[PDB]
Amino acid sequence: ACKMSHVRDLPPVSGSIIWAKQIDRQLTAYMKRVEDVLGKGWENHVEG
Amino acid sequence: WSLDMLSHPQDSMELVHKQSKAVAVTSMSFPVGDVNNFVVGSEEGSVYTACRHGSKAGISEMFEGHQGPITGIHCH
């Protein structure tokens, strides 16, 4: 993807931080799933 | 407490008497079959028989027949 961003001529640092924020996006979506499962009890839940 | 919330108390309160005497539990037992009728032994006897559900906290009633601490009891 670094070289792909270079093929797209934009600097790969921008694509790298886009990628990292995308990781953060699905991570927050997974936190949302944690809230779909436990709601808010996951702050004290064992697995939570 | 619940199975996992060790920070949030499920039902935490007290069972204190009217005056300033420090209520010292002595081998207190849970209600037999969770009928809420639990007993609390004390050092001068002082069987604190009380209920759990509703507004029946604190000290419901008591009875003494001796002055020793009840270190063994069994609600049955």
UniProtKB/Swiss-Prot annotation, chain A:
It comes from the Eukaryota. Signal peptide: none annotated. It is found in: Cytoplasm, Cytoskeleton. It is linked to Charcot-Marie-Tooth disease, axonal, type 2O: An axonal form of Charcot-Marie-Tooth disease, a disorder of the peripheral nervous system, characterized by progressive weakness and atrophy, initially of the peroneal muscles and later of the distal muscles of the arms. Charcot-Marie-Tooth disease is classified in two main groups on the basis of electrophysiologic properties and histopathology: primary peripheral demyelinating neuropathies (designated CMT1 when they are dominantly inherited) and primary peripheral axonal neuropathies (CMT2). Dynein heavy chains probably consist of an N-terminal stem (which binds cargo and interacts with other dynein components), and the head or motor domain. The motor contains six tandemly-linked AAA domains in the head, which form a ring. A stalk-like structure (formed by two of the coiled coil domains) protrudes between AAA 4 and AAA 5 and terminates in a microtubule-binding site. A seventh domain may also contribute to this ring; it is not clear whether the N-terminus or the C-terminus forms this extra domain. Cytoplasmic dynein 1 acts as a motor for the intracellular retrograde motility of vesicles and organelles along microtubules. Dynein has ATPase activity; the force-producing power stroke is thought to occur on release of ADP. Plays a role in mitotic spindle assembly and metaphase plate congression. Homodimer. The cytoplasmic dynein 1 complex consists of two catalytic heavy chains (HCs) and a number of non-catalytic subunits presented by intermediate chains (ICs), light intermediate chains (LICs) and light chains (LCs); the composition seems to vary in respect to the IC, LIC and LC composition. The heavy chain homodimer serves as a scaffold for the probable homodimeric assembly of the respective non-catalytic subunits. The ICs and LICs bind directly to the HC dimer and dynein LCs assemble on the IC dimer. Interacts with DYNC1LI1; DYNC1LI1 and DYNC1LI2 bind mutually exclusive to DYNC1H1. Belongs to the dynein heavy chain family. This is Cytoplasmic dynein 1 heavy chain 1. It comes from Homo sapiens (Human). The chain holds residues 632 to 679 of 4646 of the full protein.
From Swiss-Prot, chain B:
WD repeats lie at residues 20-60. It comes from the Eukaryota. Pyrophosphorylation by 5-diphosphoinositol pentakisphosphate (5-IP7) promotes interaction with DCTN1. Serine pyrophosphorylation is achieved by Mg(2+)-dependent, but enzyme independent transfer of a beta-phosphate from a inositol pyrophosphate to a pre-phosphorylated serine residue. It is found in: Cytoplasm, Cytoskeleton; Cytoplasm. It is linked to Neurodevelopmental disorder with microcephaly and structural brain anomalies: An autosomal recessive neurodevelopmental disorder characterized by global developmental delay, severe intellectual disability, microcephaly, dysmorphic facial features, and cerebral malformations including simplification of cerebral gyration, agenesis of the corpus callosum, and brainstem and white matter hypoplasia. Acts as one of several non-catalytic accessory components of the cytoplasmic dynein 1 complex that are thought to be involved in linking dynein to cargos and to adapter proteins that regulate dynein function. Cytoplasmic dynein 1 acts as a motor for the intracellular retrograde motility of vesicles and organelles along microtubules. The intermediate chains mediate the binding of dynein to dynactin via its 150 kDa component (p150-glued) DCTN1. Involved in membrane-transport, such as Golgi apparatus, late endosomes and lysosomes. Homodimer. The cytoplasmic dynein 1 complex consists of two catalytic heavy chains (HCs) and a number of non-catalytic subunits presented by intermediate chains (ICs), light intermediate chains (LICs) and light chains (LCs); the composition seems to vary in respect to the IC, LIC and LC composition. The heavy chain homodimer serves as a scaffold for the probable homodimeric assembly of the respective non-catalytic subunits. The ICs and LICs bind directly to the HC dimer and the LCs assemble on the IC dimer. Interacts with DYNLT3. Interacts with DYNLT1. Belongs to the dynein intermediate chain family. This is Cytoplasmic dynein 1 intermediate chain 2. The chain holds residues 410 to 485 of 638 of the full protein.
